[PDB]
Amino acid sequence: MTDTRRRVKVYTLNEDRQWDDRGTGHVSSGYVERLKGMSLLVRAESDGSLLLESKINPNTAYQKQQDTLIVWSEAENYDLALSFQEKAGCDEIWEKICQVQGKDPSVDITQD
C-alpha cells in the first residue's frame, strides 16, 4: 500500500559535515501561506508528522546531484537533501522547483 513514487529520505548536514538521516517520508509541494510561496513538504513515515516545510526560494541553487538526489542550502550553516526512491518522483519535484525559478528542468543546478 505504501506509495513509492514520492517516497524520500531527508538528510541534514551535521557538525562533522556528514549527512544525518532525519527519516523517510513522502514529499509533495504546496503553497504555504506564511512562507509566501510554493514549498516542499515532507510527511514523516514514522508517525505522519510534518518533517520538512521548505520554501522554494527563487534564488536558491538547487542541485540534482544524482538522478535521485536534490540538495540545497536552506540557510547559512543549514543544508538539506531529499533522496528519492524513484527517479520518476525526483523528476516530478525537480520540475516543480524549476517552474518556480523559471528554469528549464534539463539543468542539474538551478543557479550559476
Binding site: V8, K9, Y11, L13, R17, Q18, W19, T24, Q65, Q66, T68, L69, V71, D79, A81, S83, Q85
Partner: peptide, 17 residues
C-alpha cells in the same frame, strides 16, 4: 533487486566553498 534504496549526497569538503 537493488542493493539499497536511498542514495546519500557526498560529504562536502571544507575547501572550496
Amino acid at each position: 533487486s537493488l542493493p539499497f534504496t536511498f542514495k546519500v549526497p557526498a560529504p562536502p569538503p571544507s575547501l572550496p566553498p
